[PDB]
Design a protein around this ligand. Structure first.
Ligand SMILES: C[C@@]1(O)CCC[C@H]1n1c(=O)c(C(F)F)cc2cnc(NC3CCN(S(C)(=O)=O)CC3)nc21
Lengths: 262, 297
């Protein structure tokens, strides 16, 4: 445990949550009509709706995880079902995570008529019943939050720079767009992205993993990290009605589709 | 429900009704929480989704068990284990007699084990009140109604303000703090510990300012010494009356020195210094119920 309830007890419960929430990197093999890029365009679009409604990064990553894990239970999904499966994964996520989530009609409206409120209601129950109501994962962005606090040392009060968080989050947003990310545990992916913006010493100190635990994910993440570096990282945005100390937790969107091609 | 016969309505809220139900061929009595979906404009309520998922990962002998979830036509039934009574009915029935000190200590010990389990899994209950603490005829007490519960991050972020029932609400919530976590549940448990001892709610306010003044009259008006940052909190007023801290021999007369010590640490103003559920379990007040475990390193 990298943390300073018991330190090892809280940390082991967290590590044993990735071990109970199972996800497979080649889930799109069960859906032969689908190609890995369909998943990328969908997740990218979900990030943009998240930014439009000033939704938290956590609710995007809950929706990403519900979608990828839901698809592992299904078979023969068509390109036309994707928008409903995704917007319904986001409906569940926003209701679980936001204080005042957008209303059902706002979720139907953002699909431009392709999904009705009743279709989303039917889909959220299919999703929740297929996931056996296991809707509380430790997301990729949740690990980044844990690591950013330990870097700037009380672990429950948020004390860390917002702009650095955004730059690491931006790299994770690109990597999640590729289905091969699912081969690596969520904690490993966040620690590897953090490593690309720092070092193994900072990584091990804030995450507890050794460099051999992370080495494989680091090499896989290499191309995604260089495309971000080539373009120059983003600046922390301001959002009306969102407090300054919470601005780093709002999901943002950019040309990640172009960046993913390289 | 083709095998559970509804026997009696035992509860009612914004999202559905709770029934006592008996299995016809087994004789297994359960609590059925019915949520009518056809009446909701937002589908399955956020409270029902949080309660189900959080409870699927919280199996503990001091947490009420969610046995099953059933979707039927335009309804959602949550099946829970049944307990014959809540702590409010028990304290009321024992108001003239009193609750024996060993049973108070045992219920507190168990509630703290259920709470330390929640907190170690990063779950805040946020609705600890006597009616949500269920007892059986075998000396057990369990945490129930996770409808207002929430998973928290490390570090935490700004959560829902209006969160605990008034009489059990912690002063950092009443004073408008931006952040809160596990210490709010410990404050409610401290209020219930004193309520078990005296059979009277410790802080029975009728409004938010009245709740704060009842707290201040008992524990004394907090200042920068006992609570660094109080005077810079959104709802702090320099005009607040200055009361002196009362002696716990008058606040909780039947309580012994160890009981008083534990209670004062659970009702510490500063959420950062308020005792955790894990550390409360190691307090000398419980020495005759638990044995310390050897610690590695
Ligand atoms: C938590 C609640 O008390 C709030 C109102 C409904 C209750 N309730 C639940 O909500 C849940 C689950 F849905 F959360 C499970 C549950 C289980 N068993 C009992 N048993 C009852 C205890 C109270 N008594 S009493 C008045 O003291 O005689 C009668 C028998 N109640 C339960």
């Amino acid at each position: 445990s990298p943390l300073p309830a018991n330190r090892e007890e809280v940390w082991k419960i967290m590590l044993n949550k990735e071990k109970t929430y199972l996800r497979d990197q080649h889930f799109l093999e069960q859906h032969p009509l689908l190609q890995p890029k369909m998943r990328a365009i969908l997740l990218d679009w979900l990030m943009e709706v998240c930014e439009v409604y000033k939704l938290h990064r956590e609710t995007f990553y809950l929706a990403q995880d519900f979608f990828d894990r839901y698809m592992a239970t299904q078979e023969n999904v068509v390109k036309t079902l994707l928008q409903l499966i995704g917007i319904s994964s986001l409906f569940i996520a926003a209701k679980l995570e936001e204080i005042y989530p957008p209303k059902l009609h706002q979720f139907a409206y953002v699909t431009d008529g392709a999904c009705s409120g009743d279709e989303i209601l039917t889909m959220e129950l299919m999703i929740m019943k297929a996931l056996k109501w296991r809707l509380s994962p430790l997301t990729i962005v949740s690990w980044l939050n844990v690591y950013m606090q330990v870097a700037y040392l009380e672990v429950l009060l948020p004390q860390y720079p917002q702009q650095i968080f955004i730059q690491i989050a931006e790299l994770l947003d690109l990597c999640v767009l590729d289905v091969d990310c699912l081969e690596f545990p969520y904690g490993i992916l966040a620690a590897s992205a953090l490593y690309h913006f720092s070092s193994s010493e900072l990584m091990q100190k804030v995450s507890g993993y050794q460099w051999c635990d992370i080495e494989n994910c680091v090499k896989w993440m290499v191309p995604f990290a260089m495309v971000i570096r080539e373009t120059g990282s983003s600046k922390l945005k301001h959002f009306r009605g969102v407090a300054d100390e919470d601005a780093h937790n709002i999901q943002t969107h950019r040309d990640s589709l172009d960046l993913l091609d390289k | 429900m083709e095998n559970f016969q509804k026997v009696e309505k035992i509860g009612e809220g914004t999202y559905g009704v709770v029934y006592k139900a008996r299995n016809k061929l087994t004789g297994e009595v359960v609590a059925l929480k019915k949520i009518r979906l056809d009446t909701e404009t937002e589908g399955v309520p956020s409270t029902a989704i949080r309660e189900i998922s959080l409870l699927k990962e919280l199996n503990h002998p001091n947490i009420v068990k969610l046995l099953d979830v059933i979707h039927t036509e335009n309804k959602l039934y949550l099946v829970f284990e049944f307990l014959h009574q809540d702590l409010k009915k028990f304290m009321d029935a024992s108001a003239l007699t009193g609750i024996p000190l060993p049973l108070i200590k045992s219920y507190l010990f168990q509630l703290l084990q259920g709470l330390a389990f929640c907190h170690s899994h990063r779950v805040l209950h946020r609705d600890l009140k006597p009616q949500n603490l269920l007892i059986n005829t075998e000396g057990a007490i369990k945490l129930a109604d996770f409808g207002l519960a929430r998973a928290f991050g490390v570090p935490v972020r700004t959560y829902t303000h209006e969160v605990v029932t008034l009489w059990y609400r912690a002063p950092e919530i009443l004073l408008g703090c931006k952040y809160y976590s596990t210490a709010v549940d410990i404050w409610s448990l401290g209020c219930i510990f004193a309520e078990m001892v005296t059979r009277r709610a410790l802080f029975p306010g009728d409004s938010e300012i009245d709740q704060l003044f009842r707290i201040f009259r008992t524990l004394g008006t907090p200042d920068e010494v006992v609570w660094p940052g109080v005077t810079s909190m959104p709802d702090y007023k320099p005009s607040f009356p200055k009361w002196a801290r009362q002696d716990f021999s008058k606040v909780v007369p039947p309580l012994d020195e160890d009981g008083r010590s534990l209670l004062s640490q659970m009702l510490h103003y500063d959420p950062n210094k308020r005792i955790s559920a894990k550390a409360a379990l190691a307090h000398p007040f419980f020495q005759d119920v638990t044995k310390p475990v050897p610690h590695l390193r």
